[PDB]
Design a protein around this ligand. Structure first.
Ligand SMILES: [Mg+2]
Ligand SMILES: [Mg+2]
Ligand SMILES: [Mg+2]
Ligand SMILES: [Mg+2]
Ligand SMILES: [Mg+2]
Ligand SMILES: [Mg+2]
Ligand SMILES: [Zn+2]
Lengths: 175, 52, 136, 258, 55, 193
RNA sequence: AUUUUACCAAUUAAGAAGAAUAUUAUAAUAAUGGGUGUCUUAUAUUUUAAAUAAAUAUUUAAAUUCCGUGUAGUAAAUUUAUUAUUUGUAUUAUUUAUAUAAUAGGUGUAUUAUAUUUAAAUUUUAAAUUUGUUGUUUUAUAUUUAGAUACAUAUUUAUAGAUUAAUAUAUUUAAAUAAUAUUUUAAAAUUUAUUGAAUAAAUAUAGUAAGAUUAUUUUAGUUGAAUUAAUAAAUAAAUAUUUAUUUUUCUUUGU
């Protein structure tokens, strides 16, 4: 049996009275305290914390005219994906933003469509070679890739796509 | 020699690690932990402590 | 304490004095600085040549099988082994000649050893058996 | 810094190291969280503050309801240095050194034994250490010092055989050590220019001795003018003469001239 | 059923008035005008002066 | 270690019990305190008690913290005209226990109403509060003092200007009804094509 | 006109020859009962007998026999011998005290849920016995200190069948020759003596009642089965330690 004695000896100053004066009583008290605190943190703390945050968000929504039920359902529908912690943070520190979220949920704005399944380009069915050129599907994939490259932030590569695709022609030395 | 490494920071704080019969790889790891931490505070990791 | 133990690193300050000594403490200059005792291999006994002098023709090197001679020196009398040389299962399979010394710290001549006696390559199991029997 | 060693304490205790204990540290007095056991995070300011302020008052801490000794007084700091010099160098060795110096001008040291040489060196070292310790309190008390102790400031140095610097001599150089490794943490009163601060302190105390002598002379002259008669006490006359001769000789020994 | 009592139960007695008025309480005294001694009002000295007149 | 002194206040003690409206504790805020008016004409007792408690305990605030006991002052008016559905004023029991043996007092809602109409509202507020705060005497007593009950319509709280709090009961619901039949309006283009 | 609320806190350096011809084995050479503050004589100062005892023994066969309680000279006077205070503190190891104490005048609270300081949220302590696994039984004031014994291993000299009841028969492959020990406290009065129910021996033994049995952070199988006294019938099952079978298949499977 490994009784946590040498570790819990240093926390006896937090206790009072006989538990702090004597050793074994304080060690038993600290052992029981740590065990019950671990049990509560594992199996019962999250329930109370999430209930508190849910009640705060529900009160913030009721001050605007809705409830936690409808707000949560419409957030899931509109696919906003905001955790209750973030909802509470917005309700407490960004009331205008939270009110705008509520107005979005209340309005008849079309929610985004489901993600489109990855399709195959029409050129993949073309005979190649038809009889030193690139595959048409591969060229279209490269064009879409360069488009996505230029779409993310501003960079010195330029907005045009043909000149950036034809970089191997530039790197090629004229024989 | 005291089998321990000490880190003295730019605010007088001192952080010591025990390296008795500890491999040099572990010694290097503890030294990098020393140079990585600032040793200016100690706060838990919770939803209320995410933002300082 | 144990390495994987919570009691191992609860002494987080005070073990060292912030102020260093003025006679023996020094700063690390850089990679070209030769630290006293620094060695990549773990040497619990860091004894070197000067502190623990070795007496042999050559310093034991990975190129040389044994630090002693391999062929009789033409300027020193060579004495063959009293009994003929046989190479057994554990012998070094190489000729070993030791430079016999005199009481005046001068090499007198060179005498060949026996690989069965001084060529049986050591083994930790047998060394540990001997040591354990002696200490018990 | 509160419990271990104060500002003018000659003691040296590492506040985080329990080197004055006959038992392993079982209970930690200053504890804020249950996680302070397996990793007390000591050395951080916000926790070592709690620990060192929960520590009890020691003999030098002078707890609140208990009386606190007068330490910042020049009239106490000077006899401290004098008693340290007497504890370092005995009277017989002091007389032998004085005779040897007045006879050979620091040239016949061969008569002294190696043990006596080492005693003199250790005494000079301890005097330098205690001067480095008392330097802040001395610079604090230089304002309201008295002439007797201002002269004892040089008397103690002469007795300890330490020539004070002026812009043997042991206060001329600093302790060797690279500035990148020397201790510089705040909260610990440690001067870094000892030959530069003690020299200006000697200049200031010379000016203060001159001011005190002039104040005594002016007070005597004003008293004589108020009495409208030249009737001086024999005690006061003898005291003035002997103090003038003493300050002259003891400042000439160190090398300072008014 | 009797058991050891914690230090808190040992300090409950000083909260009552019975403990305060018994042990820790000061006196109302003055100086005997005839003996120059501390004297409580009501109790006198053996001397002839203190018996005839009450100091 | 925290320590609560045994020498606490008592009802027989001459110092008496305090008013949380007058206290100045740390966990008691008074800046964000609004005054609401709640008319109880027709509204049922448990519903009006829940609506009042949700504003008393400060649960309607987004920054509500269980420790900090902050809330709004609700002034309930026309408690004498409160309405409960039939047979409840006679059947609903209110019981309690006293220190004497066999002292199990059991009174009807009618009896408590003819004694004092405010007692019913106070009892239901106590129940709605103890539903969530029963552990700490502070958290279960301090909210109740923020309710200002008044039997008749008159009240001295005219300076605070109580706002007429509006609240909707969770009972309102429209059961499906028959689709009404009406004549259809046609269109010339529809008749053409 | 006097005039500082109640409650709430802490073990640490140790001053001193107040630590040694010190404890326990170890000496193979002496020995007529030791009694100093002692001290006349002894019809009054006598203990002896062919056995297992202050003398103590290098093996596993066979064999009497209704649990085989078992091994013989290695040398014939040969060097396994009952040793002891100093010509090494005898040497070599091992162990060792229970006298002496200034420490803080207030961090959480003040109408009552029990340490982590933003106030809430959490609980009644452990170890054994109860197999109908409890609400049954028993123990624990605290501090310090004693307290319990199956060898996790095998390097060249080197060489290892069986089988009939027996006389016999022998055409089949290996091997790291090493033994010594095996919880603790107790559950009972008979024994062997002595002195007028006590005294001193017996780890004697109880098919054996009951309890205690010192060492965290770990890395792989079954959670109610099995149950045939006794001529030629494939096989008891669980638990645990080591250890072995890579065959097909649409995925899976602790045999
Ligand atoms: Mg969790
Ligand atoms: Mg307090
Ligand atoms: Mg002692
Ligand atoms: Mg003999
Ligand atoms: Mg023990
Ligand atoms: Mg198995
Ligand atoms: Zn009198």
């Amino acid at each position: 049996h490994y009784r946590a004695k040498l570790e819990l000896d240093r926390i006896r100053s937090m206790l009072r009275g006989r538990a702090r004066l004597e050793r074994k009583v304080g060690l038993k008290r600290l052992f029981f305290l740590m065990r019950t605190q671990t049990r509560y943190r594992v199996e019962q703390q999250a329930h109370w914390e999430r209930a508190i945050v849910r009640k705060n968000v529900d009160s913030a929504a009721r001050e605007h005219g809705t409830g936690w039920q409808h707000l949560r359902n419409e957030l899931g529908r509109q696919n906003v994906m905001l955790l209750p912690r973030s909802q509470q943070l917005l309700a407490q520190y960004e009331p205008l933003a939270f009110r705008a979220v509520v107005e979005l949920c209340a309005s008849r704005i079309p929610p985004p469509p489901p993600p489109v399944v990855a399709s195959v380009p029409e050129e993949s069915y073309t005979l190649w070679p038809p009889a030193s050129l690139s595959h048409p599907a591969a060229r279209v994939e490269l064009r879409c890739g360069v488009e996505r490259v230029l779409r993310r932030g501003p960079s010195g590569l330029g907005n045009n796509v043909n000149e950036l695709i034809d970089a191997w022609k530039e790197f090629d030395v004229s024989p | 020699p005291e089998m321990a490494i000490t880190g003295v920071y730019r605010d007088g704080s001192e952080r010591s690690y025990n390296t008795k019969n500890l491999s040099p790889m572990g010694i290097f790891l503890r030294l990098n932990n020393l140079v990585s931490t600032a040793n200016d505070y100690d706060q838990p990791f919770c939803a209320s402590h995410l933002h300082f | 304490s144990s390495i994987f133990s919570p009691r191992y690193d609860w002494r987080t300050s005070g073990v060292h004095d912030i102020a260093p000594r003025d006679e023996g403490d020094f700063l690390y200059q850089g990679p070209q600085h030769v630290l006293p005792g620094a060695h990549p291999l773990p040497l619990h006994h860091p004894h070197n040549t000067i502190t623990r002098p070795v007496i042999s023709p050559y310093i034991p090197s990975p190129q040389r099988s044994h630090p002693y001679f391999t062929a009789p020196l033409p300027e020193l009398p060579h004495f063959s082994t009293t009994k003929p040389i046989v190479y057994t299962y554990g012998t070094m399979k190489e000729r070993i000649i030791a430079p016999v010394f005199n009481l005046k710290n001068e090499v007198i001549y060179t005498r060949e050893l026996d690989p069965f006696i001084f060529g049986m390559y050591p083994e930790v199991e047998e060394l540990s058996k001997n040591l354990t029997y002696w200490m018990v | 810094v509160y419990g271990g060693s104060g500002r003018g304490d000659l003691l040296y205790e590492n506040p985080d190291a329990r080197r004055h204990s006959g038992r392993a540290l079982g209970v930690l007095n200053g504890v804020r969280h249950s996680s302070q056991a397996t990793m007390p995070e000591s050395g951080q300011l916000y926790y070592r503050k709690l620990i060192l302020h929960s520590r009890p008052p020691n003999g030098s801490c002078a707890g609140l309801q208990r009386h606190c000794h007068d330490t910042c007084n020049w009239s106490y700091l000077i006899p401290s240095l004098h008693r340290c010099a007497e504890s370092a160098i005995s009277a017989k060795l002091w007389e032998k050194m004085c005779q040897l110096g007045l006879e050979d001008r620091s040239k016949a040291w061969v008569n002294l034994t190696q043990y006596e040489r080492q005693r003199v060196r250790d005494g000079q070292n301890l005097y330098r250490y205690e001067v480095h310790q008392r330097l802040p309190l001395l610079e604090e008390s230089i304002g309201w010092a008295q002439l007797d102790d201002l002269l004892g400031w040089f008397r103690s140095a002469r007795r300890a055989w330490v020539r004070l610097p002026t812009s043997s001599s042991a206060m001329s150089c600093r302790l060797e050590g690279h500035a990148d490794s020397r201790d510089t943490t705040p909260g610990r009163n440690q001067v870094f220019d000892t030959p530069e601060r003690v020299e200006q302190l000697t200049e200031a105390t010379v000016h203060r001795i001159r001011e005190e002598l002039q104040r005594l002379n002016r007070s005597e002259r004003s008293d004589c003018e108020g009495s409208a008669a030249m009737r001086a006490s024999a005690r006061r006359l003898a005291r003035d003469e002997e103090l003038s001769r003493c300050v002259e000789e003891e400042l000439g020994w160190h090398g300072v001239a008014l | 059923p009797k058991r050891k009592k914690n230090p808190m139960q040992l300090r409950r007695k000083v909260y009552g008035l019975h403990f305060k008025e018994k042990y820790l309480k000061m006196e109302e005294w003055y100086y005997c005008p005839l003996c120059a001694e501390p004297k409580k009002p009501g109790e006198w000295c053996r001397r002839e002066d203190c018996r005839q007149i009450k100091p | 270690a925290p320590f609560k002194s045994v020498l606490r206040r008592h009802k027989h003690h001459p110092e008496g019990l305090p008013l949380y409206n007058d206290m100045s504790k740390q966990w008691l805020c008074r800046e964000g305190e609004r005054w609401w008016l709640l008319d109880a004409r027709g509204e049922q007792l448990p519903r009006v008690a829940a609506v009042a408690a949700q504003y008393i305990t400060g649960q309607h605030r987004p920054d509500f913290t269980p420790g900090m006991i902050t809330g709004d002052h609700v002034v309930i008016v026309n408690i004498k005209d409160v309405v409960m559905v039939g047979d409840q004023w006679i059947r609903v029991p209110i019981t309690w226990q006293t220190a004497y043996p066999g002292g199990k007092y059991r009174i009807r809602l009618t009896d408590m109403y003819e004694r004092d109409p405010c007692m019913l509202m106070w009892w239901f507020l106590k129940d709605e509060v103890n539903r969530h705060f029963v552990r700490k005497l502070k958290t279960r007593i301090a909210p109740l003092e923020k309710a200002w009950l008044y039997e008749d319509s008159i009240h001295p709280h005219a300076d605070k200007n109580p706002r007429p709090l509006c609240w909707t009961d969770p009972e309102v619901k429209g059961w499906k009804y028959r689709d009404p039949q009406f004549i259809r309006r046609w269109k010339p283009n529809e008749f053409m094509h």
